[PDB]
Amino acid sequence: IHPLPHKIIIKKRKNKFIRFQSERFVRVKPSWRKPRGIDSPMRHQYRGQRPMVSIGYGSDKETRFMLPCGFFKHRISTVHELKTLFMNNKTHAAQIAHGVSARSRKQILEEAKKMGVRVLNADAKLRKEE
Amino acid sequence: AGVQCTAHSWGPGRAVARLPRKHGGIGAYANFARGGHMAHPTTVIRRWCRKVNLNQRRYAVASALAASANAALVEARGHRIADVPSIPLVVDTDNVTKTKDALAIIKAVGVLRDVERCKDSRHIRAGRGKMRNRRYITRKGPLVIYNTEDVARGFRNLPGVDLCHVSSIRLLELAPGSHPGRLILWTKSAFASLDDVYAAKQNYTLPRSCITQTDIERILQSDAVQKTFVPKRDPLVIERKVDPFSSKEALARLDPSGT
Amino acid sequence: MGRNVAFSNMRRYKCTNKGPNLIKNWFNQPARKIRRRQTRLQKAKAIFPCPLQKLRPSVTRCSQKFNLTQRIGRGFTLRELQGVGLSAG
Amino acid sequence: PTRIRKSRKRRGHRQMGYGRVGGHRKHPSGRGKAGGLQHKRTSFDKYHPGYFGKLGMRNYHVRRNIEYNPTINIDKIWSLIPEEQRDGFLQRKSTTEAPVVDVTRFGFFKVLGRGSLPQCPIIIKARYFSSDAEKKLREVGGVPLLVP
Amino acid sequence: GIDLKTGIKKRKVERKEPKSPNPYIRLLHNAFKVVYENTGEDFTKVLTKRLCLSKTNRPVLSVSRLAHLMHKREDKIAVVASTVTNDERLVTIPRMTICALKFSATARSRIEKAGGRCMSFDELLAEKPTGDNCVLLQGRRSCRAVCKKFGSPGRPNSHVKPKGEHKGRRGARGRHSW
Amino acid sequence: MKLNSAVTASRRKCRKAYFTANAETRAKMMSSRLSKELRAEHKIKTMPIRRGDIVEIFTGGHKGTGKVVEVRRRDYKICVEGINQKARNPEAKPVPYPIHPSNCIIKELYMNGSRYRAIKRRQERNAERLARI
RNA sequence: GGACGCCCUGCGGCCGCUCAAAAGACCUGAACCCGGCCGGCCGCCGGCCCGCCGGCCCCGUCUCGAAACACGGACCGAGGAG
RNA sequence: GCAGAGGCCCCGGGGGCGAAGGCGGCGCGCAGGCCCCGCCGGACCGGCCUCUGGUGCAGAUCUCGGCAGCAGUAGCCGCUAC
C-alpha cells in the first residue's frame, strides 16, 4: 500500500488548455484545437490571449503518468491480469475496470490483498452486502 | 441513389442557398442535403483482389510451417502446448469417423486443453457484426493436416479445430490473424508426404535458411570478433562550471600556485 | 505535375453514366469455371466411352515468328485422310 | 492504405494543401496536354523534343511478323548448349565433331558479334550474320552456315 | 537571439538504419555496426552503411564482373552487398571466394563447380569481420534505365532521350529544328 | 457447419421465417418435450402442442402443471389452465399468463385418432433412421 | 393497458394500484430553450480565498492590410467536402 | 480518436452482482484524448497486434429537425347595428 519514495511531481499547468472562443459558443466544444486562422488573435499569441499547447509544458519523464499516491496505473480486468502487477511491479498499482461486476471485484481484491498490490478503486460498487 | 429526385437550383436572389432544390425548396442532390447522392459514391469497380507471385505465396506457407515447428512461436500464438509431447506433433490416426474417438486421441496427445480453450471461448461479438451473420466468435486452436485418412468427419465438429489436406495447405489457416504459429496436428501420412508435396512444386527450391539472432550473438561473442575489438579511448570528463575565485580549492584546480 | 512525364495513351471513358455499359466486372469468374466444368462433366457423362475432343491435326503455327512450332488445327485434309484410307464421314 | 495517407493528416487545415491565394479549382491550366504550342510551350520544349510534326514514310499496315527479326550475339551462342554438353565440347575442340548450334531453333535469326566466342570450333546455322560475327566465328575456327 | 544561419549549410539526412522489413539484413547491419563501434575499421564502416543502402543504390555484380575485378587478386575475398548473378556469356568462370547478401541459383552452382566458395555476411563476420584479405566491390549504380532518362531532353546540352515515343520533327531533327 | 447451401443462416432471413411462418410450420415450431414415461410409451421425443394436453412448466414465473386451454399461434405462446396473472381485484376475469411451449414438458396428450396415426408415422420413420439411414 | 378509497356539477384531481420498473402511450431521453426552489452578480486569462487588481476588440474569410461602417454567421442537435 | 475484419485475452477476456449510452465529479496526458467514481439507464462491450475505410466540423445566403429573443408584441379598424 506504500510506493517507492520518488521525486516531487511538478505540473507546469494545472488548468486544461480550453479551445479559443469555447466560452462564447456552446457549439465550440472546449477540446483543444490548434488556432489556424489568418487573423486569429490566439495563434498570433497577442497579450491577454489564452495559453497555447506546446511540448515545453511536458512533465518530467521520470515522474510522468504517476498518480498523486506516487504509483503508476495498470487497468486490471481479471485475476489473471493481476500477473503484470505480480511480476515485481512494486512501482505500479491496480485499477479495476468499470465493467467488472462486484462479484468479480471481490475475487480480484482478495488476490490483490494476498499479493500486496494496492487497488486504487477498492471501494467501487461496494454497496452494503449483496 | 440520391439522383432519382428532380432538383434544379432556385439560384441567386431568393435569399436561399444555391444548392439544388426540389419543387417545394427541399434541398437535394448534394452530399450535405438529406437524400442527396454521396459526394463520391462507392463503386463495385474497386480492386478487391491483390496479386501475389507464386514464389512469395509459396514462401509464406513454408515460413508459416517453419513457425509451426517453433514451439516458442506456437505458445505466443495463444495455443496451450504444455502437454503436447513434441512440436511439431505427428499422430498416427486411422480414419476417425466419430467425434468422441477424435477427442480421445486429442486427450492422449495433450492437445485437449487447446480444444477446450476454444469451446469455452464462444461469445457474442460486439458491433453490427452480430446483425451481419458474424454473431459468434470462438478462439481458433488445433489444425489437423491429413492425407490418406477420413479424420475430417471425426474432428470437424470439435470446436476451434480446422482440417486441411496436405496437397492444399492454406496460409490463412497456418497463420490465423497474420500471426505465425498455428498448432498443427500432422497425421503420420501427411507429415511423411510433406517433402513429396514440395518436390512436386516443380521448379521450386525452398528458400535457403539464414542465420538467427541467437546465432549472431554467439558469432559476435566468438573470440575472433573479440580479438579484433580494440579498447576505446577514455572519455572526456565534462564536470560543471563553478566560480573558481571564491573557493581556495576551486581556484587550486585552475591556479595551484596562486592558492 | 510535369517534369519529365511520359504522356498517357489512355482513352477517355465513354458512356460512363449513360449508354451500352462498357464495364465488365469479373466477380463471375470463380462461378463461370464451376459452370463450365459442370457442362463438360454432363456432356462427358452423355457419351461415356467417347472422348469430348475430336482428333484435330498438327499444323505449323502461321508466320515466320512461329514457323518451327506446331499447334492443333481445325481438321484433317482429304489427302491426309486418303493416306489412312478413310472417307470424311 | 487510406489511414496511412497524406490527406488524412490535412484535416483541420482548410485548403487541404492546395493554398489560400489560389486553391484547388477545376482545370486551371486546361484539360489534357492542351497548350503545348502556346501556354505550355516551355514544358513541351524542355522535356518533349519531337512532339509536334511528321518524320517518316507511313506504312498503312505494318506486318508485325515480316518485321520481326530476333538477334543473338557471338557471346551467347555457347549458353544455348546445355551445360553438361558444353564442357566436353570445350576440352575436345574436335574440328571433326564440333557442336552445330541452329540459332533459328532457339528463336534467333541474325548472329551479331558483341563479345567473344570461346576458342573452340563451333558451326553456327542462321538466316543472316554480321561482318564482325563471321570474322570472330571464323577466327575461333567455326564456320558460319545458313539454314532453311 | 542567436544568428545561427550565417555560415551553417543545414542538416543532411542519411540512412542511419536499413529500412528493410527483412530480419536477416537488420540482424547483419546491427552485427557489423557493433563491430565497427568496437573496432573502428573503414571496411566495417563502409559495410555497415552499404547494408543500409536501398535496392536501387545496391546493383547486382555478375560473375563475369567479379572475375575481371578479382583477376589480379584471386586470393582476396570479394565482398558484394547485393546479389551475384551468373554471366552465361563467360563460359568458364575462375575460382574465387565471394561473400554476398544473395547469390542467384545459377551463380551459386557455377562458383561452387569452379571450386570457389560462396560465403555469407554471417560467415564473413565469423571468419573475417574487420575485413582482412577482403575487397568491397560494387555494381554500376548508373546502370538503371531510369538514371539514363534523368535530365531535360530538348535542352541543347542534355544528351538525354525523351520519355515516350514523340514521333515528330520539332526540336528532334536538329539544334536548328524549332 | 451446414453443407446444404439451399438453407439460409442469415439472421434476417431466419427471423423472417419465424415471424412470418405458415400455420403448419408454426404448429411444429411450437413443440414440447414428452415426459420420460411418455417417451418410453410413444418412443418419440417431442410432439406439437394441442389444446387438450396436461403440461408441466419448468419455467421461472408460473412454474406448475396445467391443461392447455388456448393455443395462440400468432404470439407463439400457449395458455395452460391455472397459470394466470395476479388479479387487481378478486371480482375480475382471470387473465391467462401466456407461456412458451418450449418452456414446458408434456405429461398427458389428447390422443384423438390423427395423433395416434402421427405417432405411428414418426415411429416408422425413426425406425428407418435407426436402421443405419 | 391502470385495483380501491376520497373529493368533484362535472372536467378531472388525489391516494395508490398492475409491473422488476411505469416503461402509462410509451426504450434510452442529450443540446438549445423554459418554469419552481436555490445560491450568486455576472465574459475570457493570470494571481490570491475569490472579488479585487492586471492583461484582453469578432470569429471564419479573401486580402499589401479587417474590430472594421467588407462578407457569411440568432441558437442547438444530427448530416456535410480529395 | 471512430466504425468494421482476422487473431489474442493460461482453465479461457469484461456483463442483470448491471453493457452501451446519458448526467455530474476526480485523476492522468504538452494535447488530441483517456481512465475511474457516484447517479440515471437496462443488453451488450472491448484492451492489444494485423487489416479495411462512406473515418473526426463552427462556419459553406450549408441540408434537415427542433427552437429562442422579439412578445402577451404587431394585429383581430370592408359590407351603417345592435
**Residues E64, E60: Cα–Cα separation, whole Å:** 11
Q: What are phi and psi of F34, to 5 degrees?
A: -75, 155
DSSP state of B126: S
The torsion region of residue F76 among left (phi > 0), alpha (psi -120 to 50) and beta comes to left
Burial class (CB in 10 A: 0-12, 13-18, 19+), A52: middle
Q: Are B37 and B4 in contact (CB under 8 A)?
A: no
Q: Are D70 and D115 in contact (CB under 8 A)?
A: no
Q: Which residues of B touch E (CB under 8 A)?
A: 205, 210-211, 213, 215-216, 219-220, 222, 224-225, 228-230, 232
How do F46-48 and F31-34 pair as beta strands? antiparallel
Quick check: helix, strand or coil at residue F128?
Answer: helix
Helix (H) or strand (E) holding B228: helix B223-228
CA dihedral A94, A95, A97, A101 (to 10 degrees): 80
The torsion region of residue A70 among left (phi > 0), alpha (psi -120 to 50) and beta comes to left
Specify the nucleotide whose C1' lies closest to residue A43 (CA): G59
Q: What are phi and psi of E64, to 5 degrees?
A: -90, -30
Q: Are E85 and E62 in contact (CB under 8 A)?
A: yes
Q: Are C73 and C58 in contact (CB under 8 A)?
A: yes
> Hey, CA dihedral for B83, B84, B86, B92, is it positive or negative?
positive
Residues of D within 8 A of C5 (CB-CB) are 47
Q: Are D74 and D80 in contact (CB under 8 A)?
A: no
**Residues B8, B11: Cα–Cα separation, whole Å:** 9
- The C-alpha cell 458512356 sits at C15
In one-letter notation, the amino acid at residue D121 is P
Distances (CA, A) of B66 to B75, B166, B174, C29, D72: 14, 15, 10, 34, 44
Annotated binding site of B for Mg(2+): 19
Helix (H) or strand (E) holding F130: helix F114-130
**Residues F65, F108: Cα–Cα separation, whole Å:** 11
- The 10 Å Cβ neighbour count of residue E34 is 19
Residues 6+ apart with CB under 8 A from B194: B65, B166, B186
**Residues B70, B179: Cα–Cα separation, whole Å:** 13
Closest among E144, E136, E145 to E55, alpha carbons compared: E144
CA triple A63-A67-A73, angle to 5 deg:
100
- The 10 Å Cβ neighbour count of residue B21 is 22
Distances (CA, A) of E178 to C16, D37, F89: 40, 11, 109
CA dihedral C43, C47, C53, C57 (to 10 degrees): -150
Burial class (CB in 10 A: 0-12, 13-18, 19+), B167: exposed
- The cell for B34 is 438529406
- The 10 Å Cβ neighbour count of residue E76 is 16
In one-letter notation, the amino acid at residue C28 is N
User: F93 beta carbon < 7 A from strand G?
Assistant: no
B186-212 b/e (C-beta count within 10 Å ≥ 16 → b): bbebbbebbeebeeeeeeeeeeeeebe
Cβ <8 Å between E149 and C4:
yes
- The 10 Å Cβ neighbour count of residue E110 is 22
In chain A, which residues from 57 to 96 place their CB closer than 7 Å to nucleic acid strand H? 57-59, 63-68, 73, 75, 77-78, 80-81, 95-96
- The C-alpha cell 547491419 sits at E29
**Residues A37, B145: Cα–Cα separation, whole Å:** 63
- The 10 Å Cβ neighbour count of residue B230 is 11
**Residues E99, E80: Cα–Cα separation, whole Å:** 6
Distance to chain D for C60, nearest Cα, Å: 14
**Residues E78, E99: Cα–Cα separation, whole Å:** 6
Closest protein CA to C1' of nucleotide G60, residue = A37
> Hey, CA dihedral for B1, B2, B3, B4, is it positive or negative?
positive
Helix (H) or strand (E) holding B89: strand B89-91
User: What is the resolution of the experimental data for this entry, in Å?
Assistant: 3.2
Q: Are E117 and E84 in contact (CB under 8 A)?
A: no
Length of chain F, in residues: 133
> Hey, CA dihedral for D139, D140, D144, D145, is it positive or negative?
positive
CA dihedral E28, E31, E35, E41 (to 10 degrees): 20
In one-letter notation, the amino acid at residue D110 is K
Residues of B within 8 A of E20 (CB-CB) are none
SS3 helix, strand, coil % of chain B, rounded to 5? Answer: 35, 10, 55
**Residues E43, D114: Cα–Cα separation, whole Å:** 37
- The C-alpha cell 570528463 sits at B237
User: B18 beta carbon < 7 A from strand H?
Assistant: yes
Distance A28 CA to H75 C1' (A): 40
How do E77-85 and E97-103 pair as beta strands? parallel
Helix (H) or strand (E) holding C70: strand C70-72
- The cell for B52 is 501475389
Is E21 an 8 Å CB contact of chain D? no
User: A31 beta carbon < 7 A from strand H?
Assistant: yes
CA triple B46-B51-B52, angle to 5 deg:
155
SS (H, E, C) chain D: CCCCCHHHHHCCCCCCCCCCCCCCCCCCCCCCCCCCCCCCHHHHHHCCCCCCCCCCCCCCCCCHHHHCCCEEECCCCCCCCCHHHHHHHHHHCCCCCCCCEEHHHHCCCEEECCCCCCCCCCCEEECEECHHHHHHHHHHCCCEEECC
User: B42 beta carbon < 7 A from strand G?
Assistant: no
Closest among E75, E88, E79, E81 to E116, alpha carbons compared: E75
Q: What are phi and psi of B121, to 5 degrees?
A: -65, -20
Specify the nucleotide whose C1' lies closest to residue B181 (CA): H7
**Residues F129, F133: Cα–Cα separation, whole Å:** 4
Q: What is the DSSP string of chain E?
A: ----SSS--------SS-----HHHHHHHHHHHHHHHHS--HHHHHHHHHHHS-TTTS--EEHHHHHHHTSS-SSSEEEEEEEEE--TTSSSPPP-EEEEEEE-HHHHHHHHHHT-EEE-HHHHHHH-SS-TTEEEE---GGGSHHHHT-S-BTBTT-----SS---S-TTTS-SS--
CA triple F12-F18-F19, angle to 5 deg:
85
How do E77-85 and E61-62 pair as beta strands? parallel
Distances (CA, A) of D63 to A124, C70, D59, E165: 87, 21, 9, 20
Cβ <8 Å between B219 and E39:
no
Q: Are D32 and D38 in contact (CB under 8 A)?
A: no
Closest among E124, E98, E102 to E41, alpha carbons compared: E124
CA triple B181-B186-B187, angle to 5 deg:
170
CA triple B143-B146-B150, angle to 5 deg:
110
Q: What is the DSSP string of chain A?
A: -----------S-SS--PPTTTTT-SSS-SS------TT-TTTTT-TTPPP---GGGPPPGGGTT--TTS-EEEEE-SSSGGGTTTTT-SSEEEEE-SSS-HHHHHHHHHHHHHHT--BTTTTTT--S--
- β-bridge mates for residue B9, sequence order: B20
Specify the nucleotide whose C1' lies closest to residue F61 (CA): G20
- The C-alpha cell 486421441 sits at B105
- The cell for B138 is 470462438
Strand order in the sheet with D124-126: D101-102, D124-126, D144-146
Q: Are E84 and E116 in contact (CB under 8 A)?
A: no
Nucleotides of G under 7 A from a protein CB: 1-4, 17-20, 31-33, 43-47, 54-67, 75-77, 79-82
Q: Are E47 and E131 in contact (CB under 8 A)?
A: yes
Distances (CA, A) of B125 to A66, A109, B225, F2: 35, 28, 55, 21
Is B125 an 8 Å CB contact of chain F? no
- The 10 Å Cβ neighbour count of residue A18 is 15
Q: What are phi and psi of F101, to 5 degrees?
A: -60, -35
Residues 7-46 of F with CB under 8 A from B: 9-11
Distances (CA, A) of B99 to B96, B122, B146, E141: 8, 19, 16, 63
Helix (H) or strand (E) holding F67: strand F64-72
Specify the nucleotide whose C1' lies closest to residue B130 (CA): H44
Helix (H) or strand (E) holding B108: helix B99-108
Q: Are E117 and E98 in contact (CB under 8 A)?
A: yes
- The 10 Å Cβ neighbour count of residue B4 is 8
Interface size B-C, in CB pairs within 8 Å, comes to 4
- The cell for E82 is 547485393
Indicate the residue of D43, D68, D105 with minimum beta-carbon distance to C68.
D105
**Residues E43, E136: Cα–Cα separation, whole Å:** 8
Burial class (CB in 10 A: 0-12, 13-18, 19+), E103: buried
In one-letter notation, the amino acid at residue C22 is L
Cβ <8 Å between E126 and B213:
no
- The C-alpha cell 498518480 sits at A67
